[PDB]
């Protein structure tokens, strides 16, 4: 179907097919020089230049190299600068340049490529969509909101634009507004609406309004391969890992870490209380929209495997103790943090992002009544000087209805069945 040969490229069509054939055969080295010869002899051929660009692309994948891939990205832009580029070829070339610039994290760059695709093709809705994604990738939810509004002002039936529209509304805590969009969009069946994120957030938005349909959708998404179960709905998983809401210390193998936490708990407690008395701002309010009501704040010492050096100035002995346990200080999918919660607080049901961590809680200051935590079907209480362990990739929930503050210490560990090699390579969360 797609017509990629302007008038002059039709007269050299035999040489261009010759060279693209070598490329399809796998001979990356042969074709790249066959396209570079064509580009030398035909410096205005948009099809020679695209062939060069694609061969650079295949290479940077044979080679897993970032410098050559960066070259393919300029060659893709070279295609669009030439005279008389056929439209199918100009779109294809610049889309790939955006998609491979997103792969490097040049998302400031992928953004400009996408804006140009939309200037050049103002009736293509897919490119307004793909540009909404460019805005979400860099955290610019405001500009992404307009984009999907515009798309919806023109095509209100477009699924993709609807789910993304909802996703934005949910993230803004416009929970009920979010739900028809999330629902109709998943229901459209358009390409790119069958994504776990939308199943996840429709069910969660239903739960918060008290619509008991919410688990119908958790079950749909389980059917279609997004969640491991209806209860355990994390999205950045390593498939297979033993899955259970509550673990005993021995079942994790981290008995040394647990012993240390429990034997040295009072120095951990005392540095946290010192930080509450003299250095409160180190405690930051929870900021993932997880509270229905009340006050909940966290003082973080490690995140994504990296010690916070200024934070460790306010808990120096605790940081020194934990340095001996890399199963937690190098868990690049978890944190190490004090967590304070006061009366009047209800944490919505919610799930962590990854099944690659287990979460330990050490009780530091626990009132006798009013504080409890549910993971899955079972609710439990903290104790001062004692560690509980649960998989926060399962749905969990917390209440604080006591008459003073409740303080715990939270230590994330690598899932025990994860290999040394998985631990070193998995991308941070």
């Amino acid at each position: 179907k797609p017509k990629l040969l302007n008038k002059f490229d039709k007269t050299i069509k035999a040489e261009l097919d010759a060279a693209e054939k070598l490329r399809k055969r796998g001979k990356i080295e042969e074709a790249v020089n066959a396209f570079k010869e064509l580009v030398r002899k035909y410096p205005q051929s948009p099809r020679a230049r695209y062939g060069k660009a694609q061969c650079e692309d295949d290479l940077a994948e044979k080679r897993r190299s970032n410098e050559v891939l960066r070259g393919a990205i300029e060659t893709y832009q070279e295609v669009a600068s030439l005279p008389d580029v056929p439209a199918d070829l100009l779109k294809l070339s610049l889309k790939r340049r955006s998609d491979r610039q997103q792969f490097l994290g040049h998302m400031r760059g992928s953004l400009l490529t996408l804006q140009r695709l939309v200037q050049l093709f103002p009736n293509d809705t897919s490119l307004k969509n793909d540009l909404g994604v460019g805005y979400l990738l860099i955290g610019d939810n405001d500009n992404a909101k307009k984009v999907y509004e515009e798309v919806l002002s023109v095509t209100p039936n477009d699924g993709f634009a609807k789910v993304h529209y909802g996703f934005i509304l949910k993230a803004q805590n416009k929970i009920a507004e979010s739900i028809p969009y999330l629902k109709e969009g998943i229901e459209s069946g358009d390409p790119g609406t069958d994504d776990g994120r939308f199943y996840f957030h429709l069910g969660d938005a239903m739960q918060r309004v008290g619509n008991k349909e919410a688990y119908k959708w958790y079950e749909l998404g389980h059917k279609r391969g997004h969640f491991a179960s209806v209860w355990q709905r994390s999205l950045y998983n390593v498939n297979g890992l033993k899955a259970q809401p509550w673990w005993t210390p021995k079942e994790t193998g981290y008995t040394e870490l647990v012993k240390s936490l429990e034997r040295n708990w009072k120095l951990i407690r005392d540095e946290g209380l010192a930080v509450m008395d003299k250095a409160k701002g180190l405690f930051l309010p929870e900021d993932e929209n997880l509270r229905e009501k009340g006050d909940w704040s966290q003082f973080t010492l490690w995140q994504q495997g990296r010690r916070n050096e200024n934070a460790c100035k306010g808990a120096p002995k605790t940081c020194t103790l934990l340095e001996k346990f890399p199963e937690t200080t190098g868990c690049r999918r978890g944190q190490i943090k004090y967590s304070i919660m006061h009366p009047g607080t209800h944490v919505w049901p919610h799930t962590g992002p990854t099944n690659c961590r287990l979460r330990m809680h050490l009780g530091l200051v626990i009132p006798k009544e009013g504080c409890k935590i549910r993971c899955a079907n079972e609710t439990k209480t903290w104790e001062e000087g004692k560690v509980l362990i649960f998989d926060d990739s399962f749905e969990h929930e917390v209440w604080q209805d006591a008459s003073s503050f409740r303080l715990i210490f939270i230590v994330d560990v690598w899932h025990p069945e994860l290999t040394p090699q998985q631990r070193r390579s998995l991308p941070a969360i």
Binding site: R64, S65, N66, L69, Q102, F103, L104, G105, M107, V133, L136, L137, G139, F167, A171, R197, F200, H201, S234, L235, Y236, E286, E288, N289, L290, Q303, Q304, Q335, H350, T351, G352, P353, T354, D392, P427, A428, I429
Partner: peptide
């Protein structure tokens, strides 16, 4: 913006190349 306790961000990992 990061995914610490939940899944509220469009993507939780950061693309940084090969």
């Amino acid at each position: 913006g990061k995914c610490k306790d939940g899944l509220g961000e469009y993507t939780c990992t950061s693309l940084e190349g090969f």
